[PDB]
Design a binder for this molecule. Structure first.
Ligand SMILES: O=C(CCCCCNC(=O)Nc1ccc(S(=O)(=O)N2CCN(c3cc(Cl)cc(C(F)(F)F)c3)CC2)cc1)NO
Ligand SMILES: [Mn+2]
Ligand SMILES: [Mn+2]
Length: 234
């Protein structure tokens, strides 16, 4: 099976989500053919030179999955668009483009974070265009770390446009799309390329975890607890 997760929004102040993700990496992920992280792995990112200990803790845990034979892939979210090749090397992850078409057991599947499908929010899309401009990213990353941290602290949900969904699935000629961003886990039926098509949405990790599991036989949207919930009787 191939696994998809997104919208964990990991951060120091939410250790329960981190512990849930570490358990996921040490258990479920080790049995997978591959693990894809469709953006918003971290609640914030100001560059790969950040000494935040959580970053190294997460990189080591993902690296252990990769070393166990499970390739891991990352598409950027709107929270963590500055994740770069240094973190890719630390974690063993492979960075992918904003849209990718996958062969999953003979099923062609488009994957993306999902924010680019929210074409009704033109203000957001203009902000996105600016922070994805390479010369702007370069200038921001050149600032001292302490300045970047102040900017980020100081700076501290839209849904998809149905026609943007059809356009993306016809551009890639797929009948299956998996994304996150909207935090509304669901399976939507539509029509694309003259045939029934499906859009599968991941959940954010709020109280419990969420993943999509693709097998040769089906597509599974799965909700599971962060920790081992030991039975006990009354
Ligand atoms: O979860 C969700 C969220 C719902 C959708 C909300 C969309 N809005 C949103 O995401 N905002 C946002 C805010 C702060 C951060 S940040 O703290 O990580 N960090 C990033 C780098 N960043 C920067 C970069 C560059 Cl290049 C240039 C500059 C500037 F401005 F100084 F020039 C700053 C400083 C701030 C990241 C994202 N959807 O699924
Ligand atoms: Mn998110
Ligand atoms: Mn997002």
């Amino acid at each position: 099976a191939t696994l998809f997760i997104a919208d964990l929004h990991l951060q120091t102040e939410e250790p329960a989500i981190t512990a849930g993700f570490l358990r996921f990496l040490q258990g479920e992920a080790r049995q997978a053919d591959a693990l894809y992280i469709l953006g918003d792995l971290f609640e914030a990112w100001i560059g790969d030179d950040d000494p935040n200990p959580l970053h190294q803790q997460i990189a080591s845990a993902i690296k252990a999955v990769v070393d166990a034979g499970v390739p891991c892939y990352f598409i950027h979210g709107n929270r963590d668009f500055l994740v770069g090749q240094r973190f890719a090397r630390q974690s063993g992850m492979i960075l992918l483009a904003e849209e990718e078409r996958l062969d999953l057991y003979g099923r062609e599947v488009l994957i993306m974070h999902g924010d680019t499908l929210c074409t009704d929010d033109q203000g957001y899309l203009a902000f996105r265009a600016k922070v994805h401009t390479p010369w702007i990213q370069r200038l921001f990353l050149a600032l001292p770390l302490f300045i970047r941290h102040r900017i980020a602290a100081r700076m501290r949900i839209m849904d998809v446009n149905p026609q943007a969904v059809v356009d993306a699935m016809e551009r890639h000629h797929v009948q299956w799309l998996i994304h996150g961003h909207t935090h509304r886990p669901a399976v939507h039926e539509l029509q694309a390329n003259g045939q029934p098509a499906w859009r599968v949405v991941l959940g954010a990790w709020h109280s419990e975890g969420s993943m999509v599991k693709v097998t040769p036989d089906d597509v599974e949207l799965i909700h599971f607890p962060f920790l081992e919930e030991n039975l006990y009787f009354q």
